[PDB]
Amino acid sequence: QCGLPKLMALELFKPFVMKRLVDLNHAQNIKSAKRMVERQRPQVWDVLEEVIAEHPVLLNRAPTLHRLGIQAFEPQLVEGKAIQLHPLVCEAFNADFDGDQMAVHLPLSAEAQAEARILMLSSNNILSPASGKPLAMPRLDMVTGLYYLTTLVEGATGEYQAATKDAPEQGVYSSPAEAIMAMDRGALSVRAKIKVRLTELRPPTDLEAQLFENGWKPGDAWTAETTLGRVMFNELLPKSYPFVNEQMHKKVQARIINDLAERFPMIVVAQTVDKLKDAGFYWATRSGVTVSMADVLVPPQKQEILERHEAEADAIERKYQRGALNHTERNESLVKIWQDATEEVGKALEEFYPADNPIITIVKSGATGNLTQTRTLAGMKGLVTNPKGEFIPRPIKSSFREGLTVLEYFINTHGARKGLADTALRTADSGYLTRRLVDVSQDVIVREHDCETERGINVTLAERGPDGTLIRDAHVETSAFARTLATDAVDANGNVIIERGHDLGDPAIDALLAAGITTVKVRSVLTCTSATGVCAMCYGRSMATGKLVDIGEAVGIVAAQSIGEPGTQLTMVGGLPRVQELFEARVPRNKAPIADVAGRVRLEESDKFFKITIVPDDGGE
Amino acid sequence: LTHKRRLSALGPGGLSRERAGLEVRDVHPSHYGRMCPIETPEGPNIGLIGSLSVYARVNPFGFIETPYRKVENGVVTDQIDYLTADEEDRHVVAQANSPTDENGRFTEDRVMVRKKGGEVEFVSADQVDYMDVSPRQMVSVATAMIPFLEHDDANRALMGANMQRQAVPLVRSEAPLVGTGMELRAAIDAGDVVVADKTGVIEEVSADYITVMADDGTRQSYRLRKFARSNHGTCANQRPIVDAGQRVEAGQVIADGPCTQNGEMALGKNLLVAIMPWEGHNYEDAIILSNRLVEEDVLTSIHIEEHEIDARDTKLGAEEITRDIPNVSDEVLADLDERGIVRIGAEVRDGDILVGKVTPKGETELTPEERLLRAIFGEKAREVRDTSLKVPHGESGKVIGIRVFSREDDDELPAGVNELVRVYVAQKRKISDGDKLAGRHGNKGVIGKILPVEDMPFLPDGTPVDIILNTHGVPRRMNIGQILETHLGWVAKAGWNIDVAAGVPDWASKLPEELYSAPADSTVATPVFDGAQEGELAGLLGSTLPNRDGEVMVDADGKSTLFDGRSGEPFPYPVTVGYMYILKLHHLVDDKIHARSTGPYSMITQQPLGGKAQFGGQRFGEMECWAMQAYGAAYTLQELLTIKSDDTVGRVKVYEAIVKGENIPEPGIPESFKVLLKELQSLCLNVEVLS
Amino acid sequence: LRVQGPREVQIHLVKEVQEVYRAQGVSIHDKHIEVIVRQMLRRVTIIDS
Amino acid sequence: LISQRPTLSEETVAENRSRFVIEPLEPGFGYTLGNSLRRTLLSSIPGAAVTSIRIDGVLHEFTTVPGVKEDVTDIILNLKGLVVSSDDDEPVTMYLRKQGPGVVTAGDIVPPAGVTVHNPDMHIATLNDKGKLEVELVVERGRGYVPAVQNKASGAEIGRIPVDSIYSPVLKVTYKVEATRVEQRTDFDKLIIDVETKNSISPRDALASAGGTLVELFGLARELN
Amino acid sequence: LISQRPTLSEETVAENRSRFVIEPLEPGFGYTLGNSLRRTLLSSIPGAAVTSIRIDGVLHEFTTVPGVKEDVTDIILNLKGLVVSSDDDEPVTMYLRKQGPGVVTAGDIVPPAGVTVHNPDMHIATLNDKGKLEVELVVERGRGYVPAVQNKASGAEIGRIPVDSIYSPVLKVTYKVEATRVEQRTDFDKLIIDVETKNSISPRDALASAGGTLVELFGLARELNADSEHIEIGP
Amino acid sequence: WLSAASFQETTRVLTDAAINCRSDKLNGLKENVIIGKLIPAGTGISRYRNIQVQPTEEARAAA
Amino acid sequence: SAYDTPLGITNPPIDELLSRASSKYALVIYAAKRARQINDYYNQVGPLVEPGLQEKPLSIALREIHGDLLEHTEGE
Amino acid sequence: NSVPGAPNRVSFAKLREPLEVPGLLDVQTDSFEWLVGSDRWRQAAIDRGEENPV
Ligand SMILES: [Mg+2]
Ligand SMILES: [Zn+2]
């Protein structure tokens, strides 16, 4: 759902409103209906709400970097002049509420309405088509809520106490309602560990196996050791989902959402994300997270570290005055010393801060920010770069919480301006690259089911070293997952683990590693033999839908958009210029010669140059 | 004021925005004291446009000089010399904020200085030969009005400095509780306030003029601008502040300007703020406001717009300004003056007539149906067609002024123009959802929700807060200076008194005597790079005066216990509460909302025009087409590119189908492709379509 | 491409692009990059006709 | 359990400020009761306020008056602070006339029967030598905040200046909860609610009005037999 | 007089669970109603429940009871699940005795005059073969939820187990406020309250009792000035 | 040649196409939008575009 | 499987609809054709499922597809 | 101190300003006066250490 201003909706639907006014005998003809709509008489607004019902509208935010930049929503009239946007889609649109604007388009034809209602509906596009990770998931405040809801704190009010020779167990509640009653009287902290008898929540897999041999059913009671907050959180998840009983970090929530998407229909995920949003906002409001000058604690050991490193720097300076080291050597030594000082200050800051500090709470929960920002806020700014790009060997010791002096601020401005200017042109370069990528790849479209080819490419899954057990490859999610096997995998003896034409998920890789398989041949677009376009099996499964790609999808545009979307956040060589060089297939700047043929090498240092000669072992040239 | 001190690298003989690399737009060490490193555009003009520093002066050759204090033998001397960049490159300059004795000799053994290459170094006190005039030598006028600037990151400081120039004037203005010392001088330098020319005694004070009898026999009268439209449609209103029989001195402010209060610069309003997330309404930089700001017109502003119409000559006869218009209801022209112009004090809305005008038609060639309709009603085929000036779409407000120029009575109008009529419409806009507010530290945001007073969290004494700002912004944006602003604003509003029974406290050792105690609602000044310190602020928070009931709402840490307005239970943890200076930027949803269903089209391409001035259509760019192709929405894309843009026949047929309630017809052959084909046919290319 | 073969050059291009992208912490499946490479490798220079 | 119905007792802090103690209440009950009372007291108490004004020598609010230090907009803003008490439920007209040197305050208005002004010392404007101020104000009764009504909708002629009306006599309402002892235990709590009003209506009357509104609202819940 | 009088509508969700919708009420009154209504509903209706127990098979080390598979904690929870209704607002003693293999439920308790049990099918424990269960319960009336009262001063009689008391018949109450439209204005609030009580009362009766209690409480304030201008509703 | 001209180097592309006299078959996902014909992808391909629909006899009888 | 009552245009659930079609595009064209037929009938086969008070043709077509009251083919 | 009015505003500044802030509009006015040529400009140029300014 989206909130549409009354005036905007009236203007968009003017013809429909005029039709519904004339046919309802509010106006005698089309001219009268138009005149009534222009003056906005009260009868217009009654018909407007009837007209807009079940009429989706497309929202867009420029620039449209990828597919999810345009999404269909069901409109509803709202007082005022600002469009109301659902918080969960802000990640897809890359939108923030600091003055951004969105454009609204009205589908007219029945085909367009069907496409908007099915293909482009916001609730049907949870996952990212690029990597397949969920996007319409809790973030920022919501996470900070759920985190606080599910964190366990020792020594809390109403904490469970083991039975003694004088009294039985204390913190045991007959049902979650009793726990809520206790919480409402200040007798039970929401984050206090307790024992509670649950009946409507499925227990975890191993507990279910250990307790119910015939399978858990609704109404069966079982005692769980957990906090009231975790119990409330598990009520947001679908009925059949097993109990989690774990602190809700960002990655934990992402894992849960990914599990839901794989094993549950799309509607259930859309409802669960809304429930999580509501709970997260409610408990973020009451999480106690706030910013104050006192909350920004400083490490007591900062002064000693700074004085020691200042003594070291003075020693280096006195050495330099003798002439033992050059200017570049002095700069390098100072840079190393101040890097060490910054690292020690950061370590001290991390150690000193308490667990429940709001600044650390926000970062650790994964809602937003990073520890480097905290270190520069409280600990010390560190080193800054000059216009030339080299590190200045005069660090800004004073943190912003203390306040930089004039000269430190002036030098920091250099790096700030450089970063801003770089970001200014990143967008243009990325847009140009995306345009070229889209244009080149526009011809790749899935045209048939399978080309019936035995060819493919080899992808490694794991490597075995002296430890004996084969360790999984780090880059396996982007290589082996969401692919098809070209040939059957056979272990050392010869038994087949997975037959050809099987989707490679997580269980498939787990089974293959157990059997001892390290490399697998998978069908790929590079080897597709289809006469026109490509085939579904070679491409694999669509990341967005998690199912086999369907005939008629323009995978080329999707690939181009996926490549181009993260371009804006690549440094400006190992960044966007490097990507452009690689894709343009031009001679690299720092060209490295490649051995034409094996043999023995020889070299001769020369004036401003090397020279290398390779003598083939086989042959004489 | 900032516009007049702008240094631009573009223009003839300058750079081009498409041919400017990183090197030119980066900060150079020589800028110190000449070009402000903070104030600069955020967009593609980053680094190409800057502002002159406070103390910078221009050499007749065109080079920018800055003042420095001559120091010899490690003793700062009263002599001041203006140096150029190349001239200072041969000297060692020490920062102003360096300890010095009453005599002038440096107290410390080593001083911080800048060398030839702009490199910062410790040197012996005898090596320095120049010193900075003031700690704020490097900042511009706008940057000088950000309190606690040194605690704010460069990006946020730049954003705040840029935002300060977009504040719209309010109906009533008040100076900030906490600010710099610049607000005063700037207000006088901008020249919008009225300053007495000669010392004397005020004679007569009205809302329109001020008469002052000078000390000698001379007397001077000053005319005050009242409700005068500015270049951007913002009210410019000057009002007196002096009283009859009051002695005034030359250079003393006698009338306030648009955004000034008692001779100081007042761009926004100081209001109570609580730093906490609230039910997700301030999510992603959104802001919640109390309804009080609407009831009391705290953030209300007057906006004036001018409409111009002209009656001129034509080959068919001159067009006349008349009170009678063909085919108009008698009620429509009810507020029109006898001449046909709207009456002052009327309330015009969208589509209302402002000035009545008519133009000769000439040929008629009326259609047979129209001829029959006129015959059955006996209506004359009038010679003139209506061309009256009508209020644009979405406008409103009272009519305040009318100006008429007629060639008959001089009125040297352009050739062919016989009459010129200007109408001024003024409207009072209250803060509403979607309006953009911001602070002085780059913490911008749009208003997402306006709550009734009973819903806002309130202090334990019953006082409700005015604004709720999210807590997740500050730490990652590195603009912690706003928290110090909030603390010091709370300290300023509620008076403070430092007990001096057991001597003076250690933290307050360096505070001037005047800051030992101050009454309630006392304003304070914290100059950039020389102002309130950490420990001083902490102590002042810990030494505030109680309220009317003899109790302190805010503890020594700056946090207070709030109550939930909706549920009624107290919030589990204390919340940071204080006073912040929030200013209203000129980005209001009122003037950017337009939608379109059908409107004017282009001459050649026949596509909809763009812009809110016309019934502008939104551009469906190439990237949107890529997105539609990625979705596989073939039909939506086809209708967007043909039916809704330039399928001339398809447009009218689709309108007819929608009105009649029928299926949408098939599109075909947008006009742009035909134009392209017949353009390629030119320049000798045989382009043709086969079947 | 000239020395080792068409199969290797696509491996090299995919590896380089993925390394650059993941240096910043961005996850893109190799299928998109290999589609781009497939488009990059579609024609042959004729030596003699 | 205990059998002791709660009781309410009042004390007066000032002429227009009072405190009310309700005790004994069940534990965790004072906060919600006080919040409900505060919400009703701040959003439902009826009062009287000026609905529109007309000055002799102006047509709109964006002009000035000869010999008057303040302009029309500032005069309207100053009049916003006027506090009035009315009896009848129909619009009433008050007249304000002044000439020559002096300061026009709220005490210069000549209200008709049934209309009272409780802040006669409020400053409105100042006339120096030739300022002739003639104003007519319209007073009505209502509740809450009502934005100014446009002349065209109200069918008024040019000259009338509609203004925003604030029908609310209550300034500040707060509450606190303390523990009180009973034969059962110290669990029960007492609620102290403090009310400060514009002096147009006594705090007790406003409290009674809020209580009546809440009683009649909860009558719906009680109607289930 | 109000703009539009609100109305209350009921919809049954289950045997002992219902939902009530009050609409359309003026803006800002949704929470004002709902919060106080929930608090009164869940903390003002009087009832009865078990407050202390004593099992003859255990005197120290309250871990397990001989002859039964269920531990002491499980028995305590099952008893907490019991539903009782007394009519003497004073402590009374109930006795439960069982012998031999089988299952002991609420229906096996012998109640005295006045005391009643509404869920005789509630399973209490499983008595093992050649096992005997003999327990006593203390029952009295109260209001709301009261944590277990300590017996540290009972050194002369140790073995009794005090337990948390649930007197309120209402078990769980939730409320929410939504926007709704009347005519052309959408500022109005709709209050939706979900209630679910024990077997000894229906949600309608609890709602009526809470409404009466709130009416009395606010009449306590209205009595100060009877002839005041309170917002009337009409019939 | 339509898409090549739309991409870059319009003058050179058009010159080469003119001297070569090479015709364009309008199926490239980029010239279809220029012509205004619905793209040959997603719902625009013949398989989905030429779907036939008619109620079943069982539902037709009920009416 | 088990889910809360769908609201707005999410009803009927997309999973059930996709269970009766080859892919999303086929379902889109299927619903569009049925809706066009229903509208043409309105303006001279009618809607099989009892339409609501002012249910739009598209929603009626989707409900009919969900109920399995219709059938389609794929020309090629 | 420069302004006779000088609304009260206590300052945390600990450093005395040795030089008063100059006119903020001088960049425009002085340049324009040089362009057209004015008596005050002639006097300033003469005092600055130049003869026969043009
Ligand atoms: Mg933005
Ligand atoms: Zn294939």
Author numbering:
A (entry chain D): 440 to 1011, 1026 to 1074
B (entry chain C): 440 to 1130
C (entry chain D): 1123 to 1171
D (entry chain A): 2 to 226
E (entry chain B): 2 to 236
F (entry chain D): 1221 to 1283
G (entry chain E): 24 to 67, 76 to 107
H (entry chain C): 21 to 74
Paper excerpt:
Mycobacterial HelD is a transcription factor that recycles stalled RNAP by dissociating it from nucleic acids and, if present, from the antibiotic rifampicin. We show that HelD from Mycobacterium smegmatis forms a complex with RNAP associated with the primary sigma factor σA and transcription factor RbpA but not CarD. HelD associates with RNAP by penetrating the primary channel with its β′-clamp opening domain (CO-domain) and the secondary channel with its N-terminal (N-term) domain. Indeed, HelD was shown to remove stalled RNAPs from DNA, thereby recycling RNAP and the template for subsequent rounds of transcription.
Indeed, HelD must be released from the primary channel to allow open complex formation. The major 3D class, at an overall resolution 3.09 Å, was a canonical open complex (RPo) without HelD. Finally, the completion of DNA loading into RNAP fully displaces the entire HelD protein and liberates RNAP for transcription initiation. To dissociate, HelD must exit both the RNAP primary and secondary channels to allow for complete DNA loading and full transcription bubble formation within RPo, and to allow the constituents of the AS to catalyze the first nucleotidyl transfer reaction.
